[PDB]
């Protein structure tokens, strides 16, 4: 199974400096040519930089925005790709993925799942989780419940519910910035027959602070 | 830079029937070599791009066989046989002859369904945000079409806009509906200024507001 892997994304400080990685596997990442491809709104898809294999000289190109302050290279021992990226600016933030041309063409034939780079001077944060239970008693019905993960910083964070048990009727939404920070909420809606008889728990996690967090919504 | 131009920023297509989506390039994509290369992307909501055909009309691996692409020079389609409700994303074209390498700004496909009122449900301020001086009351509409609806807070009965932080899902992939999430964020004290908080969601499937309600001194 072909795979590509970013690392190394995340906050990180205007001026300051950041290098991604890319671990590939499934295919012959030495005959390949690699790129990394950024996603922001307002720009959609932007093509950043791209390194050749050894038979074309390794050479590098990137695009004009980057120049000078980005560098791109490879380890073929490590099957890796990686972007150093220098006096980064508020313009390089958003999603940076990873994409191959293999060695018989066919474009950006794979991708990966994309790192997210936050151009920031603001701090770390973590969020504060709170249930969201109906104000009355449901009701043969569907009952929606809730979790409210508020005030953290930066994107992402990931929530499940019951551990990822229940996921057929679960909304989250896209994060909402207010004061330099995020608030996001998440439904979920079960049977009146599963709820509150069953446990209904919002596992939410903040890679950046560490964060873990199970919110059990019990009824008011 | 080569410019690619997707002029449609959405389709809108029913399940089962076939559409066609077309970009535009500045510069023939035609190479020396006898190949155009010019490559179409499809980006699923929440996930990274992925490939659907490679120089013009060359369906990738794992694409299904409702795809197919056509074009020359500087005009290009992409084609759905049978569009499937799983189809929602956005498609982009991308140019890969010169550097830099220029994508197009994409054109969304929507799903048209039929209509479907919102599933409203509003929650006043959870007792452990209270005790942290915090009073956000939240509302879910839930799986509605068409796409848009709007939605006031009231307290007590007059109309509040600020402090209101609004967020809406892709398209489903499934049902084809759209979710949304409207949070008005007051202080504590501010919540206990007043008794009745109410979300009034106003969609096409009605005439008269759908209208959920609490009050605080209960
Ligand atoms: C196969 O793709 C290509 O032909 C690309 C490129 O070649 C590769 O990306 C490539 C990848 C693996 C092996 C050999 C060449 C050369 C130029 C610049 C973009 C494009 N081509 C017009």
């Known amino acids: 199974e072909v795979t590509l892997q970013e690392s190394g994304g995340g906050l990180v400080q205007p001026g300051g400096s950041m290098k991604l990685s890319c671990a590939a596997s499934?295919?012959?990442?030495?005959?390949?040519?690699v790129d990394w491809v950024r996603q922001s709104p307002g720009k959609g898809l932007e093509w950043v930089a791209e390194?050749?294999?050894?038979?074309?000289?390794?050479?590098?190109k990137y695009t004009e925005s980057v120049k000078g302050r980005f560098t791109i290279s490879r380890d073929d021992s490590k099957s890796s790709v990686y972007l150093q990226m220098n006096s980064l600016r508020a313009e390089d933030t958003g999603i940076y993925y990873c994409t191959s041309v293999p060695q018989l063409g066919r474009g950006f034939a794979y991708w990966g799942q994309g790192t997210l780079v936050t151009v920031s001077a603001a701090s770390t944060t973590p969020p504060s989780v709170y249930p969201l239970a109906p104000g009355s008693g449901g009701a043969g019905s569907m009952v929606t419940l809730g979790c409210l993960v508020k005030g953290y910083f930066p994107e992402p964070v990931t929530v499940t519910w019951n551990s990822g048990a229940l996921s057929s009727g679960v909304h989250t939404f896209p994060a909402v910035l207010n004061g330099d920070l995020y608030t996001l909420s998440s439904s979920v809606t079960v049977p009146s027959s599963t709820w509150p008889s069953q446990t209904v728990t919002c596992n939410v996690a903040h890679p950046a602070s560490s964060t873990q967090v199970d919110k059990k919504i019990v009824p008011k | 830079d080569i410019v690619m131009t997707q002029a449609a920023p959405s389709v809108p297509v029913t399940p089962g029937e076939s559409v066609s989506i077309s970009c535009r390039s500045s510069?023939?994509?035609?190479?020396?070599?006898?190949?155009?290369?010019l490559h179409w992307f499809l980006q699923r909501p929440g996930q990274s791009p992925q490939l659907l055909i490679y120089?013009?009309?060359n369906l990738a691996s794992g694409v299904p066989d409702r795809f197919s692409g056509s074009g020359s020079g500087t005009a290009f389609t992409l084609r759905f046989s049978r569009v499937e409700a799983e189809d929602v994303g956005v498609y982009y074209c991308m140019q890969h002859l010169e550097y830099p390498f220029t994508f197009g700004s994409g054109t969304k496909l929507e799903i048209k369904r039929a209509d479907a009122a919102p599933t409203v449900s509003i929650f006043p301020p959870s007792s452990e945000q209270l005790t942290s001086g915090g009073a956000s009351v939240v509302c879910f509409l839930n799986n509605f079409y068409p796409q848009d609806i709007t939605v006031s807070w009231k307290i007590d009965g007059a109309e509040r806009s600020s402090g209101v932080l609004n967020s809406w899902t892709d398209q489903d992939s499934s049902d084809s509906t759209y979710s949304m999430s409207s949070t008005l964020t007051l202080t504590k004290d501010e919540y206990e200024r007043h008794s009745s908080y109410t979300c009034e969601a106003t969609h096409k499937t009605s005439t008269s507001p759908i209208t959920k309600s609490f009050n605080r001194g209960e």
């Open positions: 510069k023939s994509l035609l190479h020396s070599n006898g190949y155009t290369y």
């Open positions: 390194i050749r294999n050894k038979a074309n000289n390794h050479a590098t």
């Open positions: 499934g295919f012959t990442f030495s005959d390949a040519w």
């Open positions: 120089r013009v009309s």
